Design a protein around this ligand. Structure first.
Ligand code: HEM
Ligand code: HEM
Ligand SMILES: Cc1cc(N)nc(CCc2cncc(N3CCN(C)CC3)c2)c1
Ligand SMILES: Cc1cc(N)nc(CCc2cncc(N3CCN(C)CC3)c2)c1
Ligand SMILES: C[C@H](O)[C@H](O)[C@H]1CNc2nc(N)[nH]c(=O)c2N1
Ligand SMILES: C[C@H](O)[C@H](O)[C@H]1CNc2nc(N)[nH]c(=O)c2N1
Ligand SMILES: [Zn+2]
Lengths: 408, 413
């Protein structure tokens, strides 16, 4: 069946044919939908997957059934036979990484999908090696404010035992500190991890915005600590254009969003260490990081300085403070010439992207729950965009947190 | 399928365990390969389709009154069975109807207001025969529910469907709405969403005032007959002029809204019986008016005009002028309503209440189906607890369902 998606603001209908290509699961069934749940190999399992991916590769470069296509299939089988795995060609690495991005149902930034710088770190063997590759990534992608999308890809999983893992969930995050008095310094969501670094020898500057060091595991070994050189870590001070007292709140944030805990899957190979990075949508910092109760939780403070009536919730004081906070973040980043996108422009870009995808690909998997900004939802166009969600490969998937699996 | 499904709250780490999903009856639209979570909408039943459905409901009822397997239970079952066999249908007891309607609400996965599910005045209009009768019942509903501003939840149930050629239908999608008029020049006046329906009314004889907030008449279908127009007595239609606690200019925008939210186009399904006309009503969450009715582009679209009187930079977008104006609009909506002593609930309170409700439903009922996409308010989502709440969505019966628009299916006599 061909499936139709409607936009309820423009009454545009698009026809999804793409979903017929998907093979992974979604977690839903005919009777139970899990749309809001965050998280729902051997020689024999590994070949057809390999066959599938090569097939869509030579399909995407107009050489299906070609001579080059055949020998590649030949190469792969013989290689899976005698090593229980196989190694991707370069061109294949780039395609697969770009396509996992293109297939990432939760990313609103996919208009950018084909413009991705891929770093091949498959020759890496040590944590020192990784640190090096990551630093170069961070510097390339940060580019002095003019952010560029990138991904760095370390050796594929072999036997589970000798996995490569960046332990930090993101390349750049602030430390969180448990205080005797029950409160918490810095980012509360990182306290456990922060505690693992102190427990490893990290001398923590017990501050509010301390850049956690890198914890890098190479080839199944003990992870090792590495402080990223401060000159490569770009932070932005947050100020407000009308409220001169906003800089007194002392807020900064890093400019480079780089996810490092996900697993990139291509033709049945598992790349358990693939830090990737684009640039920030304002709301991520402005709404989630700053205003989640489980996070930096600044609303109450900001609402004080704004002199709002905080007695009853129906003064929408929280809403007011939230808006001004996000104005600040955009203003700061913009003033510092640091790439950032506001949620209106990012969502617009997404609807345009989505139209493109249907036009040339026959669909575009999308997770409405993740795509719709965490504030001002129905005033962005994706709120009114029906989206079909489904899982295409290559893809980014979650994996266990390393500290729940590794033996020392 | 799995017997225990766990949902997590990412703000509070609270993990709940759903068992109720096993009693899921209908399809969600989703499959293992694809999810339709964000899709808005993803001749009668026979004897042998009806027996099992009726029993399921009756069993469930007698389970709730702690009389399962009782004499009265088996006698109720035999009576219903013998009724379906001789008449091809059956009639619900008044207690069964009341239980069924409260439970359809309780099961309404899209409703953030369900904490009130058990307080619902149920008006049994199964004795209605004419559109005039329908109008009488609906007026009485409006008056009772409005309660001079202190709204009370209510539903009025008109006769169940028989052969499909004799349906009772309320044609209005909601009992109280504002007209929309298309102009020659392409501009819309009033509520652009209701243009199609306003034209139907005009065609059926309505003489339109052609203003911005003209209350549409009821268009009512009884017993499968052609529909008839009625104007709700204006004294029954409570309205609230929108003003702002701070901006004195806000009242200059000439905005008002109706107090009573009343859905009238949905089908109420109890034990295999279909009540195609079952208008029900509660009270408003601010964002419904403040964000959707007022700021949707396809609706009243006031964002720009509020943005100009606020004097905001409207040339960028990263000024977030839209967002600023949106907050203010919703402050005015909550203010005008509270100031006229008309029941309304802000999105913070409502969503917190839903979390308490949900938790209690898992505790006592083993689950509570919820549609995250609908539950999360259309503004400031992340700062309301529901956003962080994992939800399972599944369709339980009795339920409220969607149904074709009557002008698309009606056969004109
Ligand atoms: C270039 C500008 C980009 C923008 C503006 C953007 C925007 C976003 C945003 C706002 C989210 C939500 C993040 C969260 O709430 O945790 C997200 C998620 C995601 N993005 Fe992008 N992104 C960009 C680049 C990229 C790149 C380069 C990749 C991969 C190479 C990518 C893949 C993903 C994935 C897999 C997720 C889901 C993360 C998860 O499941 O936690 N994005 N994106
Ligand atoms: C008592 C106060 C109530 C509140 C605060 C409330 C809240 C809400 C809200 C905000 C929506 C979304 C409306 C929209 O976006 O169009 C909704 C939808 C819904 N509500 Fe409630 N509600 C209340 C009463 C009721 C009652 C009495 C019933 C039924 C007996 C009910 C059943 C439903 C159903 C079936 C929907 C889905 C509507 C649709 O599919 O368009 N609600 N509710
Ligand atoms: C590729 C990419 C683009 C983008 N705009 N944002 C991201 C998320 C990056 C990111 C950085 N720091 C922290 C997080 N956390 C916030 C808290 N959340 C629970 C997990 C993600 C996420 C990734
Ligand atoms: C029982 C009930 C409670 C409540 N808080 N809201 C409702 C919805 C009432 C309502 C009134 N007017 C119009 C609508 N429309 C808005 C636009 N939407 C597309 C369809 C519903 C809905 C019903
Ligand atoms: C496309 C999407 O399903 C649709 O726009 C939904 C989003 N969530 C909603 N939530 C509520 N309460 N009401 C709505 O009309 C909608 N619209
Ligand atoms: C439970 C729910 O899925 C959770 O709050 C989701 C909702 N949508 C989200 N959307 C984005 N972009 N990021 C998130 O972390 C989440 N969290
Ligand atoms: Zn689903």
């Amino acid at each position: 069946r061909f499936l139709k998606v409607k936009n309820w603001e423009t009454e545009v209908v698009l026809t999804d044919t793409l979903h017929l290509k998907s093979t992974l699961e979604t977690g839903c069934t005919e009777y139970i939908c899990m749309g809001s749940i965050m998280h729902p190999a051997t020689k024999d399992q590994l070949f057809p997957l390999a066959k599938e991916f090569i097939d869509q590769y030579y399909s995407s470069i107009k050489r299906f059934g070609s001579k080059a296509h055949m020998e590649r299939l030949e190469e792969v089988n013989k290689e899976i036979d005698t090593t229980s795995t196989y190694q991707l060609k370069d061109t294949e690495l780039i395609y697969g990484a770009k396509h996992a991005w293109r297939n990432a149902s939760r990313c609103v930034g996919r208009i950018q999908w084909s413009k991705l710088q891929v770093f091949d770190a498959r020759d890496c063997t040590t944590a020192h090696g990784m640190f090096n590759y990551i630093c170069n990534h961070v510097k390339y992608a940060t580019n002095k404010g003019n952010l560029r999308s990138a991904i760095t890809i370390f050796p594929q999983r072999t036997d589970g035992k000798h996995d490569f893992r960046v332990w930090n969930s993101q390349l750049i995050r602030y430390a969180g500190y448990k205080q005797p008095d029950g409160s918490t310094l810095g980012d509360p969501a990182n306290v456990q991890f922060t505690e693992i670094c102190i427990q490893q020898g990290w001398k923590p500057p017990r501050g509010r915005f301390d850049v956690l060091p890198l914890l890098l595991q190479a080839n199944g070994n003990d992870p090792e600590l590495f402080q990223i050189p401060p000159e490569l870590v770009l932070e932005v001070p947050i100020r407000h254009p009308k409220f001169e007292w906003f800089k007194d709140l002392g807020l900064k944030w890093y400019g480079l969003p780089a996810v490092s805990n996900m697993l990139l899957e291509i033709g049945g190979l598992e790349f358990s260490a693939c830090p990737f990075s684009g640039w920030y949508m304002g709301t991520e910092i402005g709404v989630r990081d700053y205003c989640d109760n489980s996070r930096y939780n600044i609303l109450e403070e900001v609402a004080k300085k704004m002199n709002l009536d905080m007695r009853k919730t129906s003064s929408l004081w929280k809403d007011q403070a939230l808006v001004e906070i996000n104005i600040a973040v955009l203003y700061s980043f913009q003033s510092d010439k640091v790439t950032i996108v506001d949620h209106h422009s990012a969502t617009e870009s997404f609807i345009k992207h989505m139209e493109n995808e249907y036009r040339c690909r026959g669909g575009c998997p999308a997770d409405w729950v993740w795509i719709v900004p965490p504030m001002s939802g129905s005033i962005t166009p994706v709120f009114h965009q029906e989206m079909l969600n489904y899982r295409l490969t290559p893809s980014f998937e979650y994996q266990p947190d390393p500290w729940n699996t590794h033996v020392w």
